[PDB]
PDB file of C-alpha atoms and ligand atoms in Angstrom:
ATOM      1  CA  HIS A   4       7.222 -17.684  -8.468  1.00 11.32           C
ATOM      2  CA  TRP A   5       6.632 -14.197  -9.057  1.00 15.42           C
ATOM      3  CA  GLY A   6       8.828 -11.670  -7.254  1.00 18.75           C
ATOM      4  CA  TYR A   7      10.831  -8.381  -7.869  1.00 18.92           C
ATOM      5  CA  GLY A   8      14.212 -10.340  -8.955  1.00 18.10           C
ATOM      6  CA  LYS A   9      16.106 -10.338 -12.201  1.00 19.21           C
ATOM      7  CA  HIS A  10      13.683 -12.984 -13.854  1.00 17.19           C
ATOM      8  CA  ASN A  11      10.278 -12.893 -12.087  1.00 18.36           C
ATOM      9  CA  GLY A  12       9.556  -9.147 -11.753  1.00 19.82           C
ATOM     10  CA  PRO A  13       6.421  -7.206 -12.799  1.00 19.30           C
ATOM     11  CA  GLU A  14       7.062  -7.222 -16.939  1.00 21.80           C
ATOM     12  CA  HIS A  15       6.583 -11.261 -16.196  1.00 24.32           C
ATOM     13  CA  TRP A  16       3.561 -11.391 -14.232  1.00 23.29           C
ATOM     14  CA  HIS A  17       1.128 -11.244 -17.026  1.00 22.28           C
ATOM     15  CA  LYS A  18       2.068 -14.915 -18.044  1.00 20.73           C
ATOM     16  CA  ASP A  19       0.686 -16.363 -14.732  1.00 20.38           C
ATOM     17  CA  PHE A  20      -1.976 -13.362 -14.240  1.00 19.49           C
ATOM     18  CA  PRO A  21      -3.112 -11.855 -17.512  1.00 15.12           C
ATOM     19  CA  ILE A  22      -5.386  -8.990 -15.889  1.00 14.85           C
ATOM     20  CA  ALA A  23      -1.938  -7.721 -15.599  1.00 14.78           C
ATOM     21  CA  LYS A  24      -2.658  -6.323 -18.822  1.00 12.60           C
ATOM     22  CA  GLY A  25      -6.251  -5.144 -18.057  1.00 14.15           C
ATOM     23  CA  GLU A  26      -8.241  -2.018 -17.932  1.00 15.12           C
ATOM     24  CA  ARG A  27      -8.228  -0.887 -14.265  1.00 14.78           C
ATOM     25  CA  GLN A  28      -4.387  -2.073 -13.264  1.00 13.39           C
ATOM     26  CA  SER A  29      -2.478  -0.019 -10.627  1.00 13.24           C
ATOM     27  CA  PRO A  30      -0.261   2.003  -9.978  1.00 15.88           C
ATOM     28  CA  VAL A  31      -0.743   4.769 -12.235  1.00 17.38           C
ATOM     29  CA  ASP A  32       1.028   8.146 -12.573  1.00 16.04           C
ATOM     30  CA  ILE A  33      -1.051  10.901 -11.006  1.00 17.79           C
ATOM     31  CA  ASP A  34      -0.818  13.821 -13.557  1.00 19.15           C
ATOM     32  CA  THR A  35      -1.943  16.621 -11.369  1.00 17.37           C
ATOM     33  CA  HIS A  36      -2.631  18.911 -13.807  1.00 15.29           C
ATOM     34  CA  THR A  37      -5.198  16.547 -15.465  1.00 16.70           C
ATOM     35  CA  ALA A  38      -6.957  15.260 -12.422  1.00 16.44           C
ATOM     36  CA  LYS A  39     -10.352  17.213 -11.881  1.00 15.02           C
ATOM     37  CA  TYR A  40     -11.227  18.668  -8.899  1.00 12.65           C
ATOM     38  CA  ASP A  41     -14.578  16.667  -7.855  1.00 12.71           C
ATOM     39  CA  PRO A  42     -16.492  19.131  -5.450  1.00  9.50           C
ATOM     40  CA  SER A  43     -19.210  16.215  -4.679  1.00 10.70           C
ATOM     41  CA  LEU A  44     -15.883  14.069  -2.837  1.00 12.70           C
ATOM     42  CA  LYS A  45     -16.306  13.938   0.843  1.00 12.42           C
ATOM     43  CA  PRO A  46     -13.429  14.596   3.511  1.00 10.60           C
ATOM     44  CA  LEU A  47     -11.956  11.354   3.953  1.00 15.00           C
ATOM     45  CA  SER A  48     -13.237   9.735   7.573  1.00 14.97           C
ATOM     46  CA  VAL A  49     -10.285   7.743   8.882  1.00 18.81           C
ATOM     47  CA  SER A  50     -11.333   6.441  12.385  1.00 15.79           C
ATOM     48  CA  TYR A  51      -8.464   4.368  13.747  1.00 18.12           C
ATOM     49  CA  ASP A  52      -9.240   4.974  17.406  1.00 18.93           C
ATOM     50  CA  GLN A  53      -9.822   1.425  18.136  1.00 18.99           C
ATOM     51  CA  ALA A  54      -7.383  -0.091  15.779  1.00 16.59           C
ATOM     52  CA  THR A  55      -5.613  -3.337  17.249  1.00 15.59           C
ATOM     53  CA  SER A  56      -2.896  -4.455  15.618  1.00 14.82           C
ATOM     54  CA  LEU A  57      -1.724  -8.022  16.215  1.00 18.69           C
ATOM     55  CA  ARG A  58       1.252  -9.115  14.339  1.00 18.94           C
ATOM     56  CA  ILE A  59       4.039  -8.150  11.929  1.00 19.06           C
ATOM     57  CA  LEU A  60       4.709 -10.739   8.996  1.00 20.07           C
ATOM     58  CA  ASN A  61       7.471 -11.037   6.386  1.00 21.59           C
ATOM     59  CA  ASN A  62       5.678 -12.529   3.538  1.00 24.46           C
ATOM     60  CA  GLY A  63       8.495 -12.575   1.215  1.00 24.29           C
ATOM     61  CA  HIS A  64       7.738  -9.443  -0.827  1.00 24.95           C
ATOM     62  CA  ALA A  65       7.152  -7.245   1.938  1.00 27.88           C
ATOM     63  CA  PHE A  66       6.253  -6.893   5.512  1.00 26.23           C
ATOM     64  CA  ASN A  67       2.470  -6.749   6.784  1.00 26.88           C
ATOM     65  CA  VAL A  68       1.071  -5.261  10.053  1.00 28.72           C
ATOM     66  CA  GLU A  69      -1.877  -7.381  10.378  1.00 28.09           C
ATOM     67  CA  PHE A  70      -5.138  -6.113  12.588  1.00 31.95           C
ATOM     68  CA  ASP A  71      -7.893  -7.719  13.993  1.00 33.30           C
ATOM     69  CA  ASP A  72     -10.733  -6.911  11.769  1.00 32.85           C
ATOM     70  CA  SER A  73     -13.105  -9.234  13.414  1.00 34.24           C
ATOM     71  CA  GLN A  74     -15.058  -6.064  15.049  1.00 36.14           C
ATOM     72  CA  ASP A  75     -16.237  -3.015  13.696  1.00 36.47           C
ATOM     73  CA  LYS A  76     -12.888  -1.185  14.476  1.00 34.54           C
ATOM     74  CA  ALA A  77     -10.596   0.864  12.339  1.00 34.13           C
ATOM     75  CA  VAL A  78     -12.260   1.581   9.561  1.00 32.55           C
ATOM     76  CA  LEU A  79     -12.409   4.061   6.268  1.00 33.33           C
ATOM     77  CA  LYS A  80     -15.150   5.904   5.023  1.00 36.60           C
ATOM     78  CA  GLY A  81     -16.488   8.977   3.333  1.00 37.23           C
ATOM     79  CA  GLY A  82     -14.178  10.289   0.612  1.00 36.96           C
ATOM     80  CA  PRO A  83     -15.434   8.651  -2.651  1.00 38.08           C
ATOM     81  CA  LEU A  84     -16.479   5.565  -0.769  1.00 39.68           C
ATOM     82  CA  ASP A  85     -20.151   4.140  -0.250  1.00 44.08           C
ATOM     83  CA  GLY A  86     -20.321   2.355   3.001  1.00 41.66           C
ATOM     84  CA  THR A  87     -17.620   1.117   5.498  1.00 40.85           C
ATOM     85  CA  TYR A  88     -14.129  -0.362   4.921  1.00 42.59           C
ATOM     86  CA  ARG A  89     -12.447  -2.438   7.675  1.00 43.08           C
ATOM     87  CA  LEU A  90      -8.472  -1.892   7.947  1.00 41.11           C
ATOM     88  CA  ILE A  91      -7.130  -5.673   7.577  1.00 42.61           C
ATOM     89  CA  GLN A  92      -3.330  -4.893   7.121  1.00 42.45           C
ATOM     90  CA  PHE A  93      -0.624  -2.254   6.019  1.00 42.18           C
ATOM     91  CA  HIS A  94       2.629  -2.534   4.378  1.00 43.65           C
ATOM     92  CA  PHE A  95       5.106  -0.419   2.492  1.00 45.31           C
ATOM     93  CA  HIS A  96       6.800  -0.675  -1.175  1.00 42.95           C
ATOM     94  CA  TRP A  97      10.312   0.918  -1.259  1.00 43.72           C
ATOM     95  CA  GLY A  98      13.506   1.220  -3.300  1.00 44.18           C
ATOM     96  CA  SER A  99      17.204   0.529  -3.183  1.00 45.01           C
ATOM     97  CA  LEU A 100      17.936   4.330  -3.361  1.00 46.98           C
ATOM     98  CA  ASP A 101      16.061   6.981  -2.067  1.00 44.87           C
ATOM     99  CA  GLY A 102      15.136   8.214  -5.692  1.00 45.20           C
ATOM    100  CA  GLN A 103      12.962   5.417  -6.285  1.00 47.69           C
ATOM    101  CA  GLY A 104      10.307   3.068  -4.363  1.00 45.92           C
ATOM    102  CA  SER A 105       6.645   4.194  -4.760  1.00 44.90           C
ATOM    103  CA  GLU A 106       4.294   2.547  -6.817  1.00 44.19           C
ATOM    104  CA  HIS A 107       2.083   5.756  -7.644  1.00 47.18           C
ATOM    105  CA  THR A 108       3.995   8.575  -9.208  1.00 44.79           C
ATOM    106  CA  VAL A 109       3.016  12.161  -9.141  1.00 44.45           C
ATOM    107  CA  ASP A 110       3.809  13.866 -12.421  1.00 43.76           C
ATOM    108  CA  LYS A 111       6.597  11.205 -12.747  1.00 42.57           C
ATOM    109  CA  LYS A 112       7.996  11.835  -9.554  1.00 41.42           C
ATOM    110  CA  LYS A 113       8.910   8.670  -7.422  1.00 42.24           C
ATOM    111  CA  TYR A 114       9.083   8.846  -3.840  1.00 42.71           C
ATOM    112  CA  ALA A 115      11.227   6.680  -1.758  1.00 40.80           C
ATOM    113  CA  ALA A 116       8.673   4.461  -0.249  1.00 37.89           C
ATOM    114  CA  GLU A 117       4.698   4.330  -0.250  1.00 40.37           C
ATOM    115  CA  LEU A 118       2.412   3.043   2.408  1.00 41.51           C
ATOM    116  CA  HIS A 119      -0.641   1.161   1.581  1.00 42.44           C
ATOM    117  CA  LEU A 120      -3.357   0.854   4.501  1.00 45.57           C
ATOM    118  CA  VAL A 121      -5.577  -1.831   3.068  1.00 42.05           C
ATOM    119  CA  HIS A 122      -9.541  -2.009   4.006  1.00 38.78           C
ATOM    120  CA  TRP A 123     -12.283  -4.529   2.853  1.00 36.14           C
ATOM    121  CA  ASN A 124     -15.815  -3.045   2.134  1.00 33.59           C
ATOM    122  CA  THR A 125     -17.737  -4.827   5.071  1.00 35.13           C
ATOM    123  CA  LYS A 126     -20.912  -5.536   2.714  1.00 37.76           C
ATOM    124  CA  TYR A 127     -19.020  -8.416   1.596  1.00 40.02           C
ATOM    125  CA  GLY A 128     -18.491  -9.918   5.233  1.00 43.03           C
ATOM    126  CA  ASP A 129     -14.903 -10.959   4.871  1.00 45.09           C
ATOM    127  CA  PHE A 130     -11.814  -9.901   2.968  1.00 40.85           C
ATOM    128  CA  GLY A 131     -11.337 -13.256   0.691  1.00 36.71           C
ATOM    129  CA  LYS A 132     -14.800 -12.324  -0.482  1.00 39.59           C
ATOM    130  CA  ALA A 133     -14.273  -8.761  -0.918  1.00 40.86           C
ATOM    131  CA  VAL A 134     -11.184  -9.100  -3.359  1.00 37.26           C
ATOM    132  CA  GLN A 135     -13.710 -10.555  -5.803  1.00 34.07           C
ATOM    133  CA  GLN A 136     -15.688  -7.424  -6.215  1.00 34.75           C
ATOM    134  CA  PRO A 137     -15.215  -4.342  -8.068  1.00 35.94           C
ATOM    135  CA  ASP A 138     -15.616  -2.318  -5.011  1.00 36.64           C
ATOM    136  CA  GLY A 139     -14.328  -4.682  -2.398  1.00 39.60           C
ATOM    137  CA  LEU A 140     -11.334  -2.888  -1.079  1.00 35.57           C
ATOM    138  CA  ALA A 141     -10.116   0.653  -0.207  1.00 37.45           C
ATOM    139  CA  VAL A 142      -6.413   1.218  -0.210  1.00 38.89           C
ATOM    140  CA  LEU A 143      -5.191   4.773   1.208  1.00 35.47           C
ATOM    141  CA  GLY A 144      -1.628   5.253  -0.195  1.00 33.55           C
ATOM    142  CA  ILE A 145       0.694   7.625   1.565  1.00 31.56           C
ATOM    143  CA  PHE A 146       4.152   8.446   0.055  1.00 31.37           C
ATOM    144  CA  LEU A 147       7.282   8.427   2.054  1.00 32.18           C
ATOM    145  CA  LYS A 148      10.101  11.002   1.499  1.00 31.63           C
ATOM    146  CA  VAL A 149      13.548  10.717   3.369  1.00 33.37           C
ATOM    147  CA  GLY A 150      14.141  13.917   5.455  1.00 32.23           C
ATOM    148  CA  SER A 151      13.134  14.017   9.489  1.00 33.40           C
ATOM    149  CA  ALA A 152      12.204  10.635  11.111  1.00 34.79           C
ATOM    150  CA  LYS A 153       8.541   9.613  11.822  1.00 36.47           C
ATOM    151  CA  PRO A 154       8.627   9.002  15.208  1.00 32.93           C
ATOM    152  CA  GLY A 155       5.402   6.794  14.968  1.00 33.54           C
ATOM    153  CA  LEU A 156       7.455   4.748  12.532  1.00 35.86           C
ATOM    154  CA  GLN A 157      10.073   3.691  14.793  1.00 38.33           C
ATOM    155  CA  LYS A 158       8.214   0.805  16.685  1.00 36.93           C
ATOM    156  CA  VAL A 159       7.677  -1.038  13.268  1.00 35.55           C
ATOM    157  CA  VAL A 160      11.356  -0.378  12.240  1.00 38.79           C
ATOM    158  CA  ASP A 161      12.826  -2.139  15.429  1.00 37.23           C
ATOM    159  CA  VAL A 162      10.838  -5.147  15.111  1.00 34.77           C
ATOM    160  CA  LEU A 163      12.159  -5.528  11.599  1.00 31.41           C
ATOM    161  CA  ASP A 164      15.555  -7.419  12.809  1.00 30.89           C
ATOM    162  CA  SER A 165      13.007 -10.328  13.949  1.00 32.55           C
ATOM    163  CA  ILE A 166      11.188 -10.628  11.237  1.00 31.34           C
ATOM    164  CA  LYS A 167      14.248 -10.591   8.526  1.00 33.06           C
ATOM    165  CA  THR A 168      13.550 -13.341   6.311  1.00 35.60           C
ATOM    166  CA  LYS A 169      10.329 -14.809   4.698  1.00 35.18           C
ATOM    167  CA  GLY A 170       7.969 -16.547   6.983  1.00 36.56           C
ATOM    168  CA  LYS A 171       9.042 -15.169   9.885  1.00 36.97           C
ATOM    169  CA  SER A 172       6.181 -13.416  12.041  1.00 41.25           C
ATOM    170  CA  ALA A 173       6.258 -11.508  15.587  1.00 40.01           C
ATOM    171  CA  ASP A 174       3.580 -10.289  17.943  1.00 39.87           C
ATOM    172  CA  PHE A 175       2.783  -6.522  17.230  1.00 42.27           C
ATOM    173  CA  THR A 176       0.176  -5.412  19.584  1.00 40.77           C
ATOM    174  CA  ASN A 177      -0.855  -1.787  20.594  1.00 39.97           C
ATOM    175  CA  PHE A 178       0.577  -0.397  17.110  1.00 39.36           C
ATOM    176  CA  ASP A 179      -1.145   2.703  16.462  1.00 38.23           C
ATOM    177  CA  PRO A 180      -1.284   3.254  12.711  1.00 38.02           C
ATOM    178  CA  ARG A 181      -2.634   7.055  13.289  1.00 41.41           C
ATOM    179  CA  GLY A 182       1.016   7.976  13.930  1.00 44.32           C
ATOM    180  CA  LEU A 183       1.822   7.134  10.129  1.00 46.46           C
ATOM    181  CA  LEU A 184      -0.827   9.790   8.840  1.00 44.94           C
ATOM    182  CA  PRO A 185       0.305  13.324   7.366  1.00 42.98           C
ATOM    183  CA  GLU A 186      -1.155  16.337   8.713  1.00 41.09           C
ATOM    184  CA  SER A 187      -3.596  16.719   5.304  1.00 39.00           C
ATOM    185  CA  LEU A 188      -6.010  14.243   4.137  1.00 38.52           C
ATOM    186  CA  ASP A 189      -6.365  15.930   0.903  1.00 36.15           C
ATOM    187  CA  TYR A 190      -6.547  13.084  -1.718  1.00 35.55           C
ATOM    188  CA  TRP A 191      -6.606  11.583  -5.445  1.00 34.00           C
ATOM    189  CA  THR A 192      -8.843   8.626  -5.936  1.00 35.43           C
ATOM    190  CA  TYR A 193      -9.446   6.514  -8.904  1.00 36.03           C
ATOM    191  CA  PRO A 194     -10.411   2.831  -9.459  1.00 35.94           C
ATOM    192  CA  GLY A 195      -7.545   0.235  -9.684  1.00 38.79           C
ATOM    193  CA  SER A 196      -6.060  -2.942  -8.631  1.00 37.16           C
ATOM    194  CA  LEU A 197      -4.113  -4.913  -6.099  1.00 37.62           C
ATOM    195  CA  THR A 198      -0.303  -3.851  -7.180  1.00 40.97           C
ATOM    196  CA  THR A 199       0.810  -7.512  -6.648  1.00 44.91           C
ATOM    197  CA  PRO A 200      -0.620 -10.754  -7.882  1.00 42.50           C
ATOM    198  CA  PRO A 201      -3.412 -11.983  -8.189  1.00 46.07           C
ATOM    199  CA  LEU A 202      -3.306  -7.947  -9.570  1.00 47.57           C
ATOM    200  CA  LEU A 203      -7.370  -8.373  -8.754  1.00 48.48           C
ATOM    201  CA  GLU A 204      -9.552  -5.279 -10.292  1.00 47.86           C
ATOM    202  CA  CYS A 205     -11.219  -4.566  -6.748  1.00 46.61           C
ATOM    203  CA  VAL A 206      -9.490  -1.563  -5.382  1.00 50.08           C
ATOM    204  CA  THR A 207     -10.552   2.276  -4.769  1.00 51.88           C
ATOM    205  CA  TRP A 208      -7.292   3.836  -4.580  1.00 49.57           C
ATOM    206  CA  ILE A 209      -7.176   7.082  -2.253  1.00 47.16           C
ATOM    207  CA  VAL A 210      -3.678   8.437  -2.574  1.00 46.43           C
ATOM    208  CA  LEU A 211      -2.784  11.196  -0.077  1.00 46.27           C
ATOM    209  CA  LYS A 212      -1.169  14.239  -1.628  1.00 47.99           C
ATOM    210  CA  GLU A 213       0.958  15.222   1.531  1.00 45.77           C
ATOM    211  CA  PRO A 214       3.588  12.843   2.018  1.00 46.71           C
ATOM    212  CA  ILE A 215       5.024  11.664   5.336  1.00 43.96           C
ATOM    213  CA  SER A 216       8.843  12.299   6.034  1.00 45.38           C
ATOM    214  CA  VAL A 217      10.942   9.160   7.864  1.00 44.83           C
ATOM    215  CA  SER A 218      14.456   9.158   8.309  1.00 45.60           C
ATOM    216  CA  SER A 219      17.346   7.887   5.905  1.00 43.88           C
ATOM    217  CA  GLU A 220      18.219   5.321   8.993  1.00 45.63           C
ATOM    218  CA  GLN A 221      14.437   4.172   9.066  1.00 45.52           C
ATOM    219  CA  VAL A 222      14.226   3.510   5.097  1.00 46.57           C
ATOM    220  CA  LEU A 223      18.093   1.856   5.426  1.00 48.93           C
ATOM    221  CA  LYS A 224      16.215  -0.584   8.117  1.00 44.83           C
ATOM    222  CA  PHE A 225      13.544  -1.538   5.577  1.00 49.10           C
ATOM    223  CA  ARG A 226      16.325  -2.438   3.047  1.00 44.06           C
ATOM    224  CA  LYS A 227      18.034  -4.657   5.300  1.00 44.30           C
ATOM    225  CA  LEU A 228      15.210  -7.159   5.190  1.00 43.96           C
ATOM    226  CA  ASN A 229      15.193 -10.149   3.077  1.00 46.12           C
ATOM    227  CA  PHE A 230      13.002 -11.617   0.253  1.00 49.76           C
ATOM    228  CA  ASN A 231      14.829 -14.982   0.817  1.00 47.54           C
ATOM    229  CA  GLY A 232      13.683 -17.457   3.673  1.00 47.60           C
ATOM    230  CA  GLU A 233      16.247 -18.590   6.488  1.00 48.51           C
ATOM    231  CA  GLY A 234      19.523 -20.481   5.153  1.00 45.93           C
ATOM    232  CA  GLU A 235      18.879 -19.532   1.612  1.00 44.76           C
ATOM    233  CA  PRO A 236      20.916 -16.964  -0.394  1.00 43.49           C
ATOM    234  CA  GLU A 237      20.395 -13.176   0.805  1.00 46.45           C
ATOM    235  CA  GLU A 238      18.575 -11.291  -1.466  1.00 46.77           C
ATOM    236  CA  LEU A 239      17.947  -7.872  -0.101  1.00 42.13           C
ATOM    237  CA  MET A 240      14.077  -6.937  -0.117  1.00 43.46           C
ATOM    238  CA  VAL A 241      14.375  -3.700  -2.177  1.00 40.96           C
ATOM    239  CA  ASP A 242      12.766  -2.588  -5.059  1.00 39.64           C
ATOM    240  CA  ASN A 243       9.434  -4.052  -4.219  1.00 40.02           C
ATOM    241  CA  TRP A 244       7.453  -1.963  -6.245  1.00 40.14           C
ATOM    242  CA  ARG A 245       5.264  -2.197  -9.558  1.00 40.39           C
ATOM    243  CA  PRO A 246       5.777   0.318 -12.319  1.00 38.41           C
ATOM    244  CA  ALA A 247       3.020   2.858 -13.188  1.00 39.25           C
ATOM    245  CA  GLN A 248       0.235   1.049 -15.487  1.00 39.20           C
ATOM    246  CA  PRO A 249      -1.710   2.531 -18.559  1.00 42.27           C
ATOM    247  CA  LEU A 250      -4.144   4.582 -17.558  1.00 43.48           C
ATOM    248  CA  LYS A 251      -6.724   3.491 -19.976  1.00 44.15           C
ATOM    249  CA  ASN A 252     -10.284   4.665 -19.571  1.00 41.34           C
ATOM    250  CA  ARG A 253      -9.808   6.343 -16.161  1.00 43.11           C
ATOM    251  CA  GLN A 254     -10.301   9.506 -14.581  1.00 41.78           C
ATOM    252  CA  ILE A 255      -8.315  10.455 -11.754  1.00 40.09           C
ATOM    253  CA  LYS A 256     -10.243  12.926  -9.391  1.00 39.86           C
ATOM    254  CA  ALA A 257      -8.947  15.213  -6.787  1.00 38.65           C
ATOM    255  CA  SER A 258     -10.660  15.995  -3.463  1.00 37.01           C
ATOM    256  CA  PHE A 259      -9.059  19.666  -3.398  1.00 35.33           C
ATOM    257  CA  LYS A 260      -8.303  22.860  -5.111  1.00 37.02           C
TER     258      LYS A 260
HETATM  259  N1  LIG B   1      -0.180  -3.658  -2.672  1.00 39.86           N
HETATM  260  S1  LIG B   1      -1.788  -3.322  -2.470  1.00 39.86           S
HETATM  261  O1  LIG B   1      -2.165  -2.573  -1.394  1.00 39.86           O
HETATM  262  O2  LIG B   1      -2.426  -3.246  -3.800  1.00 39.86           O
HETATM  263  C1  LIG B   1      -2.151  -5.007  -1.815  1.00 39.86           C
HETATM  264  C2  LIG B   1      -3.240  -5.052  -1.053  1.00 39.86           C
HETATM  265  C3  LIG B   1      -3.867  -6.522  -0.620  1.00 39.86           C
HETATM  266  C4  LIG B   1      -3.014  -7.458  -0.936  1.00 39.86           C
HETATM  267  N2  LIG B   1      -3.659  -8.634  -0.543  1.00 39.86           N
HETATM  268  N3  LIG B   1      -3.698  -9.882  -1.413  1.00 39.86           N
HETATM  269  N4  LIG B   1      -4.045 -10.863  -1.344  1.00 39.86           N
HETATM  270  C5  LIG B   1      -4.510 -11.434  -2.504  1.00 39.86           C
HETATM  271  C6  LIG B   1      -4.801 -13.088  -2.646  1.00 39.86           C
HETATM  272  C7  LIG B   1      -6.574 -12.889  -2.236  1.00 39.86           C
HETATM  273  C8  LIG B   1      -6.436 -13.171  -0.680  1.00 39.86           C
HETATM  274  C9  LIG B   1      -4.997 -12.604   0.025  1.00 39.86           C
HETATM  275  C10 LIG B   1      -4.277 -11.559  -0.022  1.00 39.86           C
HETATM  276  C11 LIG B   1      -2.330  -7.466  -2.276  1.00 39.86           C
HETATM  277  C12 LIG B   1      -2.023  -6.292  -3.015  1.00 39.86           C
HETATM  278 ZN1  LIG B   2       1.003  -2.189  -1.738  1.00 38.00          ZN
END
């Protein structure tokens, strides 16, 4: 099966999933000088005050914090979006070292990690139907740099020892994702894809310019997770990021400056 190992990583994915070589793949390098400011872009509206987390899951490629998406609660709207996108899960990608880990890059700069808040367009009724549409998902991407701790991340970090290995889950209620948001909602946006198989071309990407800082100790605990299941040979869950893909016929737009 696909993964991030020595034999099944991103450069192999195209054999099982040929849209890996498609026209709107993610992530990309954000060349900041060529992104154009679009005065028609609206402020992002992030309304997470009623978000209801339920569980955290090691899915073998990352960990997902899952939400109740059966009511109109945590939604994302505005920005470049038409309509209303509901939060279903968040997860991260990260490196073996602080100098790599992000999926998007900024002028070729890699960050230590990247948070993806995944939302689906309510017009399609559920997530599984949304991923089949060109405007089905909106993923809010947030860079992580290593410096001062993020206090609103620590609840996630501390539960990680309970989901060390693939398939493990733990109840995870009352987690407030507002504690993961940088001060500014300035962003870049472009049309792209899921960054893991099946690599579907269904995402409006919204990448915040301002990173969040997390501590070395916090990111070190991400790197103690395992890709393998319990009782299998230990493979640390590190470098679970896809490299930048060709921009092809795409423009990245900036909400600022
Ligand atoms: N890394 S990412 O945010 O682009 C992302 C978000 C969500 C994803 N969910 N993928 N699934 C795809 C198969 C269809 C339904 C199950 C979830 C995959 C990748
Ligand atoms: Zn992701």
